[PDB]
Design a protein around this nucleic acid. Structure first.
Ligand SMILES: [Mg+2]
Ligand SMILES: [Mg+2]
Lengths: 175, 187, 112, 51, 129, 52
RNA sequence: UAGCCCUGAAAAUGGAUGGCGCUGGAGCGUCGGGCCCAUACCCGGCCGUCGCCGGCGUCGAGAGUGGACGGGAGCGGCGGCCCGGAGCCCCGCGGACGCUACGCCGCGACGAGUAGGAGGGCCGCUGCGGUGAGCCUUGAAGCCUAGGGCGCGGGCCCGG
RNA sequence: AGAACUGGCGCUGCGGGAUGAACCGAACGCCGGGUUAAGGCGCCCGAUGCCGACGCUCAUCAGACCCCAGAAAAGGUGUU
């Protein structure tokens, strides 16, 4: 999987074909984060085959719709659970972020386990993602934003090189 | 690029005859004018038999002709053969069949005309029939040569029938081991 | 599927390919079809004599689709002008070589 | 081979219906341009006449 | 600008640079006529870049522009009068040349004749007095 | 056997008046079926944590 | 417990992320939009080979995918005092190019290649039989050439 | 040194890998336009001269793109 750009949460349901042995299969439901609806129903046949005795040729999916949240304006605090495969062994990991949407959260996880653990986009598996409200977030860089009357300046500002005169006569004041 | 073929894309058949015979070149120019204008096939079969080599136009004998014309349905048709008609002597009686060919021999065209036949070439055939309607087209035994009986599997393995090349068919020439089981082995 | 890119088109991306990159065959010799008579003279045996009745069989794959698709010369599409991504990994794995199901309607327009 | 959908009357040599497929879809995206801008001013002139 | 021939297309020639033999730059035991390199290792047959091109069929000029002089006529060398009156019916598409063997007496003879018959000759003022 | 139920099944459709299309076809793609979620709702599943 | 950096960590002419260099990146990891080019792909031109062809209808009198005459019955359209009928052209005596049939002309697809095999060569050298009412002291062969050309090329021609 | 399957160099250029038989693209008549492939976008060198986005890392031997041209056990209150 590439995680190309920001992701997009999909809610995919699917079932295996009705055999003469068994009618009415249970028609499982998952929650897949993917850049488009082709990868979403192609990670869906990876997590189902880990958990049931099913695969793509004996099954199908019957709904691949994007679910998108009830608050793209209210700021949220998410605690997620991972299953990354490291170089030495594998692990289990809880991890917190804080952004407007789960499209901006689990993308922010994928752009960071690649940073702080070198975990490429195919190893890491998402278990469950639910928000947790204020003063339950243990992770300290979240903990400093449970703070009303919050403030800080913009120290040491620099931007837009080469854009102006290439050889100006003006030393750039950083405010 | 396109593919990985081994090329047969150049066809290898005859398109203009390798003989510088100016009379056959006046019969190609007649027939390939009539091959693409007839909207039929009898010219286009004659037109490619004027291309063929000296071997593949074998000499049709007289008695193959007067046997294949005695079938029910060939009673007054004018037999056409591309190649030379040589007379046989093994038959005794020659009917008044009408033929049309290049180069009937001197003795055959006596024996056709004395019994009241008529011989033709391929220029008074076109006037008689541009379609070539009402004819039978014949050809001699193209595998009749002594060359073709040298050709088979190999003159050494089982069921040969291949006539191996010796300089004289006789005793102590290719008859000692390979031909009899008492000396060496038998093929 | 390591070497191809196959998906399911919709109707105007089958309507542009026939009109712009469609080429017919009579016996051999790929011709510009460019008429209603270059189709019906060689394929009016099947009742799909005109242009849009040909494109109706190729979309709703119906009666004479083997006889209709083998009439068409293979569509010689130009190089994709928007770009591609990595060319050798699957379209699941970020690349573009395989089953993509409706993103091929984007890609037909870039190939043409 | 002149390109269909880049000159007209090569569409009409090959698909003769596609002229009257077109002046249905130049009317109905002109009269529905009329239908919007008349109504988008109708809630804009009613809000204006209040002041 | 004498006799104004017929139709001239704008002459394209694919090359004006006269294929030289490989390694004719280094020696004078090698004349500059082309012979193709049938060595096994050399990098002209193997066609590396930045080197001498070798002639193949792609450089052949257009069929209505082949053997065309830049004037627009086509040369055809004659030797006396009686083969210059073969060229009366081609006096606007084909032109005459007088061969070097033809002496200046005869070359003075067939330069008035090619003005009556209105043919361009390409060397009228040669070996004159 | 499939020629022998293509002989008597040929003449059975011959006196019946149709164009039965006895020739067998390969496995066609799945036509648009229609599922039922009677009363209850799909059971959510998600990958298990790692254990040895 | 594992990511980075450090220790572990020594080799002989002066030396290698290719180099100069690089530290709010020109390093590492995950990604986006742009943008640059191969003899690759697409469109167009031109050459050649191959595949299926097209014309001896120069028939300006030729036109046929049904053609003729022909009498026994009726339709319009011909010309009236409601009956009904050949015109072989002519006031122009007229209408380009072309089919070396071994030549043209059309469409279409492909093009790399040693060893090797074919086909082509109006490329070349020396002689012979024919042929050019050829060539020349009013200057041949040869050779030279910062002279002008042609051929894709083997090579050729003209001026000096 | 010896094999099996298939591809490839030998017989084969070109783009990229600084350079190279064999890697990664891709196969070649001569050309003008357009676009991409593998790759790249400080300057040699065509192109980020984007107000590119998110985190990590300081070396007194930094690190810096398949084959590929230098490395391990073990250790650190160096830092997340
Ligand atoms: Mg070699
Ligand atoms: Mg050779």
């Amino acid at each position: 999987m590439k995680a190309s750009g920001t992701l997009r949460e999909y809610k995919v349901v699917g079932r295996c074909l009705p055999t003469p042995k068994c009618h009415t299969p249970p028609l499982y439901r998952m929650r897949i984060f993917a850049p488009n609806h082709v990868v979403a129903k192609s990670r869906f046949w990876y997590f189902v085959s880990q958990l049931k005795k099913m695969k793509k040729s004996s099954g199908e999916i019957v709904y691949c719709g994007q679910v998108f949240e009830k608050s793209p304006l209210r700021v949220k605090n998410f605690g997620i659970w991972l299953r990354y495969d490291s170089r030495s062994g594998t692990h289990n990991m809880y991890r917190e972020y804080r952004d407007l949407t789960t499209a901006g959260a689990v993308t922010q996880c994928y752009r960071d386990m690649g940073a702080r653990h070198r975990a490429r986009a195919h190893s890491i598996q998402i278990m469950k993602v639910e928000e947790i409200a204020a003063s339950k977030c243990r992770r300290p860089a979240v903990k400093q934003f449970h703070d009303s009357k919050i403030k800080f300046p913009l120290p040491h500002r620099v931007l837009r090189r080469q854009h102006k005169p290439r050889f100006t006569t003006k030393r750039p004041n950083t405010f | 690029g396109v593919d990985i073929r081994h090329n047969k894309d150049r066809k290898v058949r005859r398109k203009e005859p390798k003989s510088q015979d100016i009379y056959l070149r006046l019969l190609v120019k007649l027939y390939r004018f009539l091959a693409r204008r007839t909207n039929s096939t009898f010219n286009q079969v004659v037109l490619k038999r004027l291309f063929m080599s000296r071997t593949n136009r074998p000499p049709l004998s007289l008695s193959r002709m007067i046997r294949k014309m005695k079938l029910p349905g060939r009673e007054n048709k004018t037999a056409v053969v591309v190649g030379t008609i040589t007379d046989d002597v093994r038959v005794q009686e020659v009917p008044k069949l009408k033929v049309c060919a290049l180069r009937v021999t001197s003795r055959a065209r006596s024996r056709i005309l004395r019994a009241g036949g008529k011989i033709l070439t391929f220029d008074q055939l076109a006037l008689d029939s541009p379609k070539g309607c009402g004819t039978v087209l014949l050809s001699g035994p193209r595998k009749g040569r002594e060359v073709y009986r040298h050709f088979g599997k190999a003159p050494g393995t089982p069921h040969s029938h291949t006539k191996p090349y010796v300089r004289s068919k006789g005793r102590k020439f290719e008859r000692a081991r390979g031909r009899r089981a008492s000396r060496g082995y038998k093929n | 599927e390591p070497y191809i890119a196959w998906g399911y088109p919709n109707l105007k991306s089958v309507n542009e390919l026939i009109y712009k990159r469609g080429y017919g065959k009579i016996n051999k010799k790929r011709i510009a079809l460019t008429d209603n008579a270059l189709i019906a003279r060689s394929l009016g045996k099947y009742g799909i004599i005109c242009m849009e009745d040909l494109i109706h069989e190729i979309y709703t794959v119906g009666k004479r689709f083997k006889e209709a698709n083998n009439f068409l010369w293979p569509f010689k599409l130009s190089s994709p002008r928007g770009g591609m991504k990595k060319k050798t990994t699957h379209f699941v794995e970020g690349g573009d070589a395989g089953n993509r199901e409706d993103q091929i309607n984007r890609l037909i327009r870039r190939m043409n | 081979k002149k390109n269909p959908l880049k000159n007209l009357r090569i569409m009409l040599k090959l698909n003769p219906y596609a002229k009257t497929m077109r002046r249905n879809t130049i009317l109905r995206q002109a009269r529905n341009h009329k239908l919007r801008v008349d109504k988008a001013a109708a809630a804009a002139a009613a809000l204006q006449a209040k002041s | 600008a004498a006799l104004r021939p017929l139709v001239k297309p704008k002459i394209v020639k694919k090359r004006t640079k006269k294929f030289i033999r490989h390694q004719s730059d280094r020696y004078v035991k090698i004349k500059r006529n082309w012979r193709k390199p049938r060595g096994i290792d050399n990098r002209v047959r193997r066609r590396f870049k930045g080197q001498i091109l070798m002639p193949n069929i792609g450089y052949g000029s257009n069929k209505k522009t082949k053997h065309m002089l830049p004037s627009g006529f086509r040369k055809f060398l004659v030797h006396n009068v009686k083969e210059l009156e073969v060229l009366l019916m081609c006096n606007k598409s084909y032109c005459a040349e007088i061969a070097h063997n033809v002496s200046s007496k005869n070359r003075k003879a067939i330069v008035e004749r090619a003005a009556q018959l209105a043919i361009r000759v390409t060397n009228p003022n040669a070996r004159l007095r | 056997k499939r020629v022998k139920e293509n002989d008597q099944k040929k003449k059975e459709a011959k006196e019946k008046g149709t164009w039965v299309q006895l020739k067998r076809q390969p496995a066609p793609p799945r036509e648009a079926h229609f599922v039922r979620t009677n009363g209850k709702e799909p059971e959510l599943l998600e990958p298990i944590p790692y254990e040895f």
